[PDB]
Amino acid sequence: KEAKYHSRQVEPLGKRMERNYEFPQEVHQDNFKFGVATINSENTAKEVMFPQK
Amino acid sequence: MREIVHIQGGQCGNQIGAKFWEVISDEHGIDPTGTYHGDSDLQLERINVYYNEATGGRYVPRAILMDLEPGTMDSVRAGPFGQLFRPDNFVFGQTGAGNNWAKGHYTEGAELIDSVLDVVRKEAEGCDCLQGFQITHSLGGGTGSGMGTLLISKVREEYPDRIMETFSVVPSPKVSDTVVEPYNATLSVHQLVENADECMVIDNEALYDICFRTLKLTTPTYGDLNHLVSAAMSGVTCCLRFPGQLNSDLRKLAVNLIPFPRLHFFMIGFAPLTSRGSQQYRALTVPELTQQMFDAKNMMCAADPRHGRYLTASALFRGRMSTKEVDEQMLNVQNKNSSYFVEWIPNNIKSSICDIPPKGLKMAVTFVGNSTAIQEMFKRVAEQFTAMFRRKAFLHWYTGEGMDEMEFTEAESNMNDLVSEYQQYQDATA
Amino acid sequence: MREIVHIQGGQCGNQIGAKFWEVISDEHGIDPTGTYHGDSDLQLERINVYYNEATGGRYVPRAILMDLEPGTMDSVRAGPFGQLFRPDNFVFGQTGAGNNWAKGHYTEGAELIDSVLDVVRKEAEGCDCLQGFQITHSLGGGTGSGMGTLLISKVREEYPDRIMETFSVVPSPKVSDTVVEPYNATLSVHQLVENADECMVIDNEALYDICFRTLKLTTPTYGDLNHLVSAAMSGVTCCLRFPGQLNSDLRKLAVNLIPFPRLHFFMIGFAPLTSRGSQQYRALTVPELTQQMFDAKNMMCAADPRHGRYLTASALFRGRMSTKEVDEQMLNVQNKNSSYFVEWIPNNIKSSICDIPPKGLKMAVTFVGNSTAIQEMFKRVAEQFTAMFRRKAFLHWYTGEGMDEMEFTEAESNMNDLVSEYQQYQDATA
Amino acid sequence: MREVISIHVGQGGIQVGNACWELFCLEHGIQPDGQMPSDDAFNTFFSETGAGKHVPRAVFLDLEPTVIDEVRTGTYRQLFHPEQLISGKEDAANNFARGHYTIGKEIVDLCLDRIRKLADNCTGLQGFLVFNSVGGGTGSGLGSLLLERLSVDYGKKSKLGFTIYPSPQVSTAVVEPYNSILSTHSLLEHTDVAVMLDNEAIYDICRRNLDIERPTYTNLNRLIAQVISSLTASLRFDGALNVDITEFQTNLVPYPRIHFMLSSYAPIISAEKAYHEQLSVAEITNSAFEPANMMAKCDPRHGKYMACSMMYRGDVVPKDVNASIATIKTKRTIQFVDWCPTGFKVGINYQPPTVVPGGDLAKVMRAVCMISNSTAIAEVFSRLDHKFDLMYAKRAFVHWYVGEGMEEGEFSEAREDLAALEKDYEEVGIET
Amino acid sequence: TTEPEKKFNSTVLIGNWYEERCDPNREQSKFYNERKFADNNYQKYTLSENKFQDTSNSWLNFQENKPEVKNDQFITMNMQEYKKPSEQKRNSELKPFIVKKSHFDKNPHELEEYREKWTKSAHTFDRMYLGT
Ligand SMILES: Nc1nc2c(ncn2[C@@H]2O[C@H](COP(=O)(O)OP(=O)(O)OP(=O)(O)O)[C@@H](O)[C@H]2O)c(=O)[nH]1
Ligand SMILES: Nc1nc2c(ncn2[C@@H]2O[C@H](COP(=O)(O)OP(=O)(O)O)[C@@H](O)[C@H]2O)c(=O)[nH]1
Ligand SMILES: Nc1nc2c(ncn2[C@@H]2O[C@H](COP(=O)(O)OP(=O)(O)O)[C@@H](O)[C@H]2O)c(=O)[nH]1
């Protein structure tokens, strides 16, 4: 009954301010890794030359 | 006969050789297990070029890898095509050169070189004969810059009649990797110019420029650069391995490329490199191949070549093409770029042909042109070196293992004299 | 099968012997009763060395317990494992000794010594091929040094072919446990150097040593101190009861550790002894153990081993360990401590390897050492003797049983001789 | 075949090292019991027992029993050796004279005995990482002597010090400036390199990223823990291009004397509102050199730059690094010293960073750590100058230094040491 | 700074408290979690047991509690190297550098995956010679 003082629901002790948003639970749960992207790997490194086709 | 051995130092040389051996193995049809799996008879005719044989029928590469630190060699061994090498050949220290020439050339390298020299002597004496030494390394790293040059020096002091080929990736100022790069680069250049029979520098700046502009694949990694260096490598030795109409060994290349004793620096370029989006679109023809292999952008170094006129240039065409087309194109180009060719050495383009092409494509061309334009890299390196040396910055280490300022003065003087003598012929007229 | 017999006298001898049979009881797999509940076959082939056989399959140790007072005997059977010992003229008196050496050797001891030699002859002849005798007793105690030694003299007179071993605990000046203590010790040393082939000294004062400065237990009790002596005692015969690469029985040690007839005094130690605190974080291997054995603190005798030099030493390695490391460590330790080893005798360290370590451990070593330093132990004991004799203190008590002062001077006469003779090798040069 | 000796002295080093070890433990999956639940990476900061658990290569030195007793009784009591936590009985009482001349002597000797034990166990020692807080007495006194002792005992091996200097405006003691000037002299002539981590800035870092207004010393200590990991990331994990400990003062020490630089870490954005931004390397680097990322209270803008060695950890392809160098150079706000036209040492690694469970940080896939040496570092030493000058005029608190075994003149001589160091910095910055 | 003699029932941080507490036979071992490690009175209604250290009973023979040591402690070398030619495998320790177990050896499938994908893949040799 003390948290909702507008001083406990903000400015906590030893933890980030609880700005309650909602993550998309389908991701972010197991190993979702922030970031813009994982430097998407392109097609081929070597087969570009020596076409093998 | 007329066989060649491969000894490499530093991480850069280690990687480059690890890729070149894979390229050659693919070309000859060697599978990772070491047992032959080629198809054609000519796939085996010249297996003496780079491979020795042990009991049981498997093949091993005649390469001795040397690196002062164990991480690079350990990583290289456990990956693909790491089991072909003889572990007895491996040699390394346990300290780490720390990018310091003093450490890599006077204190640590001097003691560490004994075993490497012994194994090199054994390998050289083992087989029928010798024709040259091809060495890959970088002038910017301490361990390479020191041990590689010292090994070349001792090798020349021991063998006076065989040629030596060395490739170094000089540090272009735009993209740098070490603050003390100019010091070791200039000092190694000095130590090499006096005793290097052949050197063909490859610039990573032009590497990146080409790997962006030509192929147009957005995010190539180190693998692509290493490959292109290796393909350029194989372009110069395919002649000694396969038959044709006009063979040309490394000594012949020296004969047709080096006008004077003090001029043994070359810049190369590989073609064709077609973008995945257009490979079906570009046509395969001698005029197009020649136009590209003379294209400015196709060469491996950022030093602008149009800033001077080639002293002499030779090319090793690969594949089946009528010699007349090559000769006619060479004549036409020599006429069309007269201003870009010196006027006292007529008929200054060399030709060659090989029958069996590379793996999959039809016509392949490797370019080796000693252009007066190579002045720019040394000029920029000297420009940074003079400023770096005005305040003796970072000089206390270099003096901390016995090497004094007199050695630096001598090295800088030699490099500047080389630059002056190299610009001398640019203004020379008949 | 070259069996051995254990005879203990006096309180100290009985207590140490009580635990000694306890440790061996567990290793072979003997229950507090004597029905086999071990696991492997290695614990029955050589179970004849210390244990006989009887009807019903119960194993009963061939031990002799002997004291002039009943208190000590009643206690041993009182605790667990007291059900094993033979109730058989099982010698005990009803007069007590009262810390009087003369009392235990001439009047009171003599009237009972005849019977004890009767049974000892009985048990000894039981073995097929006798190996030797081992006796544990005390010098500062009445019954032990006095009545026990007279038994030592008799045995030699009847079986010169077998060798005798002892585990002699002598008082140390620092820790005080008796006032007439200095006398009875000197009166006993003379009587062993003439008959006993091997003597190993354990100092009750020292025994805290490993206990408090290395083992680091706040309240060790006499129960704890007993094992340490027990730990070393069981390790002397490591090869005699299990297979191995290099079997080395007791007789080997005598010729291997006693260069001269009258320098058969050794000091022993045990390792690796590590406190309950760091039981897990230290590695047990050849390098670790070998450094602990020669540390001065670890040795079981009050004398510092760095005040002189060694002549011979024995190492009984236990557990499966590679031979090369043992030999290399032995040589490495020898050279680095040249100043501590006499010069005229070369190769003054021996090795031995058994096939099985004690239960609950992987590797273990017992050290048996001869040092010219052991002179430091007697001088303090002898020094006390001279100071307290000029007043004939306590003399009248010893003169009441017929022992005449004409013999006390004789006893001290040889005591110094052992000091002088044993010493002249501390700086003798060939 | 490579390892490092970790020496913690003083509470400041003890606590910070305490927090960092949690970060190290998770990175390799070593449980508190020491056993591994389920390649040769752990060798760098652990020593095998031959069979079973693992032990850390560290030795804790302190005088006050209380702090260590918590370590010897905490949730990680089962990691260190029982006999490597040497301790004394009497505290230094924040009087440096007690930690170097009267009391610290009786336990400094014990340190060398244990250390030579670990080194003997080691095979290829590379260097030392010693933590000492200048504002902490016990660390201050024992920091100075140890560096002198090690140099004579070992010689040419390198060493770095993650010191914790006082804040320009925030203060914890009242005599802190005195112990710094004395201690600083001990480190200039015996330490090849030192790192600046003044606690004042770290608070600023906390507010502008995490949105936290009651950080606790565990929160402050956590950030440093990741900073150390960045420097040693290459020594133990495979990568495309590595940078070694010996290759730190090869590219970060213009002259023997000038051996100080301040580091920064980023990006630091937790799961709260980190999703809303790209975190691409091109933009991550831009945050690197902003004045708000300086983990030390100084104004890089006040001066030029000598040479900055920045090591990346993550999935950054090497190419995206190159475009960064071009972007930074063209900028005009950050100006380089004249006599080092190229001074960027580029590092790359593959293993991404870790997150301690229940902490403020999140798990971002890209991480950049900067160790930059700047002429602005003279500001920190210049500002402490007035603190020393003002008090010594009236010799306040001096009377407790003369009576503990320290000569009065010791204070006077320290004045020249900092005076010369300030003069040299301005001397280097002048263009030719 | 000298070693003091035992005075206080162990549990205090006074000298020689680490070693003494390690003893399992002592009742002091195995203390209560909520004793210490207590954030607040109400978070956990009550205590819990955790145990202290993991040490053997008798100071000597401290290697007990490990079944692996028990298993190998009762074999002989003669029984370890000459057992039988049928199913005897080497046990000597080689150099780590020679047992790297290259990736190709790690996963056999990738070994055969290579080759046809790269070896003898649409190569042209039809040499332009009179004889051939
Ligand atoms: N990094 C870090 N530094 C701290 C912390 N707490 C205190 N300090 C610093 O430590 C300095 C003083 O040393 P302390 O750690 O407080 O105590 P100490 O190390 O035992 O030194 P003494 O007081 O002489 O015993 C202060 O000026 C603080 O700047 C902390 O939690 N983390
Ligand atoms: N082309 C190419 N160049 C590399 C690679 N790795 C490193 N380099 C170059 O090597 C230079 C540094 O050399 P260095 O590592 O110090 O030489 P070392 O002392 O032998 O290790 C850098 O400027 C890079 O450009 C690579 O995989 N490919
Ligand atoms: N280590 C050890 N020494 C003991 C023990 N009991 C007696 N001693 C030693 O024996 C000496 C006294 O021997 P004493 O009782 O007179 O022998 P006794 O005449 O046969 O009864 C003392 O100085 C002690 O050092 C014991 O349990 N352990």
Ligand SMILES: [Mg+2]
């Ligand atoms: Mg024999």
Ligand SMILES: [Mg+2]
């Ligand atoms: Mg403190």
